[PDB]
Amino acid sequence: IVGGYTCGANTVPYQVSLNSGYHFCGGSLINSQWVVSAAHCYKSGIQVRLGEDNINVVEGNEQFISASKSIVHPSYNSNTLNNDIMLIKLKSAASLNSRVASISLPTSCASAGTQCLISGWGNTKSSGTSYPDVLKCLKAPILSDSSCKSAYPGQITSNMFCAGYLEGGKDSCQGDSGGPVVCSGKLQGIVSWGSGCAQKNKPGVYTKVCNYVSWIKQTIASN
Ligand SMILES: CN1CCN(c2cccc(CN)c2)CC1
Ligand SMILES: [Ca+2]
Numbered sequence: 001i002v003g004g005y006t007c008g009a010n011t012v013p014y015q016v017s018l019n020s021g022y023h024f025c026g027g028s029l030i031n032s033q034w035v036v037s038a039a040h041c042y043k044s045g046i047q048v049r050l051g052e053d054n055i056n057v058v059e060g061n062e063q064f065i066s067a068s069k070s071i072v073h074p075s076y077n078s079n080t081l082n083n084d085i086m087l088i089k090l091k092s093a094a095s096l097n098s099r100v101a102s103i104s105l106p107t108s109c110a111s112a113g114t115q116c117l118i119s120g121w122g123n124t125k126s127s128g129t130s131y132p133d134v135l136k137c138l139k140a141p142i143l144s145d146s147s148c149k150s151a152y153p154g155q156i157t158s159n160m161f162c163a164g165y166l167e168g169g170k171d172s173c174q175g176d177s178g179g180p181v182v183c184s185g186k187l188q189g190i191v192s193w194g195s196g197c198a199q200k201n202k203p204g205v206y207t208k209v210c211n212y213v214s215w216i217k218q219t220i221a222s223n
């Protein structure tokens with residue numbers, strides 16, 4: 001996250017870190033046994049880390065649980081990042097508590113202008129590299145579909161939306177991928193891609209979760 005702030009320990013209790021010997025992507029806990037993340041985050045041998053604040057220090061509220069299965073969306077296109085969503089099932093159920101909590105799925109799509117909370121352990125510099133140890137947060141509005149498609153002509157599908165600031169300075173960035181965009185208490189977005197981070201007229205692009213609600217509920221009911 002570039003231009004954000006230190007969330008505070010366990011203040012975003014649905015945020016997970018996906019770890020394959022190191023943190024590589026975020027995700028969001030949607031019930032005790034399932035996480036949703038970005039399909040571009042897929043790899044085998046994922047461990048889900050719940051209850052994290054400093055991802056380099058055991059602070060005492062973590063749960064570490066290996067994934068038993070991964071399910072990439074059937075229409076995910078790695079060329080275009082269309083349908084950039086996957087589900088990960090935990091081998092054992094998370095212990096739900098004030099620090100490890102699920103986030104609800106959207107019952108509908110959010111409007112342009114709705115303020116959202118975006119969070120992660122990705123790079124905090126728009127030029128160069130610095131990765132935080134503690135979780136970083138950003139409040140950012142959903143942008144209109146026209147400003148999103150203007151910013152990235154020929155690349156935005158109906159399964160994507162933009163959020164952020166056209167003036168730059170505040171954005172998600174590398175290592176935030178897969179993590180949550182929460183608006184009105186629902187998971188509306190998954191951090192997906194962009195052109196650099198926090199640059200003018202290049203806001204972040206997010207997978208539009210409200211298009212996937214039926215697929216998520218059907219897929220977890222059958223798995
Ligand atoms: C080479 N980078 C380019 C920018 N990427 C990125 C990843 C997530 C979110 C955003 C939104 N700013 C950008 C990471 C890979
Ligand atoms: Ca920790």
Ligand SMILES: [Cl-]
Nearest residue numbers: 211212213214
């Ligand atoms: Cl749907």
